[PDB]
Amino acid sequence: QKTLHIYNWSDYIAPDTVANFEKETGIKVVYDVFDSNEVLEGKLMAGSTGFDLVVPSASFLERQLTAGVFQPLDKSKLPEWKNLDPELLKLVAKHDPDNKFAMPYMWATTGIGYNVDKVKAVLGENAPVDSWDLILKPENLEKLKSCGVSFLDAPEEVFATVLNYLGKDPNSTKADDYTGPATDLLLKLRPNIRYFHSSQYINDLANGDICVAIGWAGDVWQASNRAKEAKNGVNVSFSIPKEGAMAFFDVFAMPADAKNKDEAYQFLNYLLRPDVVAHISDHVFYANANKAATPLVSAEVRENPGIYPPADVRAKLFTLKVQDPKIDRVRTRAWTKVKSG
Numbered sequence: 001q002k003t004l005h006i007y008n009w010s011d012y013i014a015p016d017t018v019a020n021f022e023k024e025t026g027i028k029v030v031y032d033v034f035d036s037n038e039v040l041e042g043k044l045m046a047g048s049t050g051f052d053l054v055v056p057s058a059s060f061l062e063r064q065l066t067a068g069v070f071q072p073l074d075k076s077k078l079p080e081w082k083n084l085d086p087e088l089l090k091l092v093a094k095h096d097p098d099n100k101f102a103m104p105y106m107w108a109t110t111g112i113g114y115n116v117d118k119v120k121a122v123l124g125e126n127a128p129v130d131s132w133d134l135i136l137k138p139e140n141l142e143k144l145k146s147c148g149v150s151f152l153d154a155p156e157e158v159f160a161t162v163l164n165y166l167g168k169d170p171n172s173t174k175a176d177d178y179t180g181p182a183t184d185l186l187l188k189l190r191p192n193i194r195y196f197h198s199s200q201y202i203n204d205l206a207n208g209d210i211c212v213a214i215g216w217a218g219d220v221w222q223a224s225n226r227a228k229e230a231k232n233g234v235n236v237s238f239s240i241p242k243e244g245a246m247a248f249f250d251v252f253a254m255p256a257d258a259k260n261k262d263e264a265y266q267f268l269n270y271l272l273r274p275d276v277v278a279h280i281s282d283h284v285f286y287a288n289a290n291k292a293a294t295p296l297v298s299a300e301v302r303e304n305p306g307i308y309p310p311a312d313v314r315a316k317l318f319t320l321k322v323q324d325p326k327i328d329r330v331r332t333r334a335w336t337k338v339k340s341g
């Protein structure tokens with residue numbers, strides 16, 4: 001009679017996680033998947049989804065903090081909550097103050113995807129692939145222009161990255177920071193950027209038509225794996241630069257009208273086990289938010305600096321704060337001015 005209804009991304013869990021949880025607890029888990037965040041968000045805002053646990057983005061959960069859509073997590077029913085990284089917890093608290101509604105599941109960054117061979121051919125073995133200097137210094141973008149440079153069509157993320165690169169507050173609330181120095185540097189870099197797109201760079205990296213790109217980690221790993229599967233000889237790598245990068249989190253959350261709260265808390269505690277989430281990370285190739293699980297992650301994933309960055313880089317990570325409307329308008333018009341080049 002024990003029932004638990006979960007809604008998650010497809011292939012966003014280890015193949016045997018649900019089976020092991022069912023065999024250990026005796027609960028019958030109804031595990032449904034979605035291939036697009038629009039479906040999950042529309043169902044959640046429509047209400048009465050019938051799900052006990054869902055996996056939305058932390059930004060959507062932040063947008064839905066006062067709508068009564070999610071249930072505040074009873075921290076007393078989660079003793080292993082201490083296993084979570086306090087640094088990543090502080091990072092996600094900006095989307096969820098006091099970590100009230102969401103348990104961080106996996107996370108990724110907005111970093112640099114690049115062709116190793118072409119970059120080291122036009123910039124040498126000393127190419128600063130571990131720094132935004134590779135793509136945010138005009139002197140290097142001039143030498144990289146011939147092999148192809150692409151930027152995301154995401155003004156918020158790109159502007160936050162540029163503000164962090166310039167030493168300013170990555171989520172500055174001053175419009176002068178956006179219209180002034182950030183716009184100045186972006187317009188200085190513009191003549192070397194081939195296009196602004198948030199999806200074409202995947203296949204363009206896989207085929208070698210683009211050699212350096214601002215990209216989300218999952219997209220760059222998909223491009224590199226596509227190149228590997230094609231056996232085309234294109235070596236695509238992803239780097240979280242040393243100056244820091246924007247981080248984004250997927251979270252487990254409990255809808256307010258969940259009928260199986262006990263089983264949901266049991267599943268959350270199961271996910272808080274280091275070995276469980278470490279196995280999940282071994283399968284999905286994403287870094288999890290469980291510190292105690294880090295030594296248990298496979299050396300293939302744990303020792304990848306583009307997935308598990310060192311402490312000095314993790315201390316420079318940041319999340320995207322929701323901006324006041326005037327900042328949004330200034331950002332959009334500045335991005336329109338930048339893209340006109």
Ligand SMILES: [Cl-]
Pocket residue numbers: 009250
């Ligand atoms: Cl995802």
Ligand SMILES: [Cl-]
Pocket residue numbers: 248
């Ligand atoms: Cl994102």
